[PDB]
Design an enzyme around this catalytic site. Sequence first.
Site, short mmCIF file in Angstrom:
data_model
loop_
_atom_site.label_atom_id
_atom_site.label_comp_id
_atom_site.label_asym_id
_atom_site.label_seq_id
_atom_site.Cartn_x
_atom_site.Cartn_y
_atom_site.Cartn_z
N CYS B 74 -61.62 -33.63 48.50
CA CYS B 74 -60.17 -33.67 48.32
C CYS B 74 -59.72 -34.39 47.05
CB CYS B 74 -59.51 -34.35 49.53
SG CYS B 74 -59.30 -33.30 50.99
N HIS B 160 -60.51 -45.98 57.02
CA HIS B 160 -60.51 -47.13 56.14
C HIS B 160 -60.27 -48.41 56.92
CE1 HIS B 160 -60.43 -44.85 52.33
NE2 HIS B 160 -59.71 -43.98 53.02
N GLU B 209 -68.02 -47.65 50.34
CA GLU B 209 -67.68 -46.35 50.90
C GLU B 209 -68.56 -46.01 52.09
OE1 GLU B 209 -66.97 -42.93 48.67
OE2 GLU B 209 -66.04 -43.93 46.95
N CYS B 218 -62.84 -45.37 44.06
CA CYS B 218 -62.55 -44.65 45.29
C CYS B 218 -61.03 -44.52 45.42
CB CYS B 218 -63.15 -45.38 46.50
SG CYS B 218 -62.80 -44.59 48.07
N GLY B 221 -59.55 -45.11 48.87
CA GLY B 221 -59.62 -46.53 49.21
C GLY B 221 -58.49 -47.33 48.58
#
Lengths: 160, 275
Positions: B74, B160, B209, B218, B221
């Site tokens: 994505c 997360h 990750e 990231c 993130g």
Amino acid sequence: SMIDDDGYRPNVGIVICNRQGQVMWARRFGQHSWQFPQGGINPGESAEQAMYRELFEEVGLSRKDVRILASTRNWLRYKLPKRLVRWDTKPVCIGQKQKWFLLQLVSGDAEINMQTSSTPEFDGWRWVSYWYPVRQVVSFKRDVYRRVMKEFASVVMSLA
Amino acid sequence: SMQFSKMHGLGNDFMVVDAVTQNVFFSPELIRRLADAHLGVGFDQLLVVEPPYDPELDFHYRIFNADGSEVAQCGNGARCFARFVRLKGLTNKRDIRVSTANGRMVLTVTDDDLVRVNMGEPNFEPSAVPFRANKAEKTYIMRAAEQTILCGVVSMGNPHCVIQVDDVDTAAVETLGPVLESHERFPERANIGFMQVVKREHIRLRVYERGAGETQACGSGACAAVAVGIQQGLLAEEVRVELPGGRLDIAWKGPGHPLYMTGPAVHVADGFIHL
Ligand SMILES: Nc1nc2c(ncn2[C@@H]2O[C@H](COP(=O)(O)OP(=O)(O)OP(=O)(O)O)[C@@H](OP(=O)(O)OP(=O)(O)O)[C@H]2O)c(=O)[nH]1
Ligand SMILES: [Cl-]
Ligand SMILES: [Cl-]
Ligand SMILES: [F-]
Ligand SMILES: [Mg+2]
Ligand SMILES: [Mg+2]
Ligand SMILES: [Mg+2]
Ligand SMILES: [Mg+2]
């Protein structure tokens, strides 16, 4: 006839863009393939004269419905797929040789009309994003379309 | 000779190819050859820009790895793609509609030549993370080894867990990271973010990750950390995020709104190679 000594029919192709930078995409009558309008130059006409004539015949647009923004310099050629060549028809046409015109539609969409002629070549149309035709055109025209749309891009990417 | 560019986004080196005005087919063999730094060009990933499949989109693009396989992660490559098509005059639009292997996006190029991506609305529901807890909390307690930790939990589409630290350089990312990444309360594991809040508008971040350990940039993130920090009343509506790989800027008006991520793309070079 108009067929040249290599078997190419002189032809003019039309890229019509609106103010959003979309281009007109037209469905071949009674089929499900789509394309830009194009047509043969007739005896005694210039490329630009053939363009305006085919334009009205195929899409119903007059001289005042459009503005010429650009045209390609030299002939762009494509070959018919061998399977579609009519070898019995003298002189043999193995493909078409095209000069391309970029037109801006300056009238409203309602001025488009695909039935001005006895034998309409299209039965539908829509606006599509500028590069979509490079993927969707039939394969044997793709190299011509890629070159045409590349050449016209700077002009279209300037109407904001 | 095929023209190409080299670009850098999210701490990754992209080779980028206009396959709209150039006629090129990227077989796995051609891709692996191009990935070879001596025989070819050399790249982390290959980003190939194509005409759209849908008449209402502007482009499609694909990303290939050095093995020659199409990668579907994505938003990957989105910032380089958006800057590339404007830099090469393939479009003049500032809102670019594009399809990828993961779906479609509207990318916005800002006046500072940054690219903003709509990342969707963060989901704090534990069940959607997935996270083992009875009801959502702005902060959670978790035991990790013989140590206890406070953290926020959120899903940006992936899981997360965000932990506040006093300095990212002095964080036990390498011991606490693994322990929490596969913590039993994350049945699908989770990405573990270590967030040092400099100001309400400025954080530093390191991310362990899921499955992959510490990476350089990231993007999800960064979004998750800023979403947690906002949900916890610690962060402003717009936050600079400094990552090992570079800087992102996150913006979120809180629940009910999508979160936005804005990032740079560097045009490193142009080149050509005969195929
Ligand atoms: N599959 C497919 N075929 C296409 C497409 N566009 C054109 N063709 C076929 O290619 C042949 C020639 O088409 P074009 O070069 O576009 O030119 P023409 O339409 O003949 O005249 P023009 O340039 O407009 O004056 C025709 O086959 P025929 O000569 O048998 O005439 P048909 O199939 O019509 O019975 C078309 O049907 C397409 O998009 N998809
Ligand atoms: Cl007229
Ligand atoms: Cl979107
Ligand atoms: F015609
Ligand atoms: Mg015609
Ligand atoms: Mg005609
Ligand atoms: Mg005709
Ligand atoms: Mg005709």
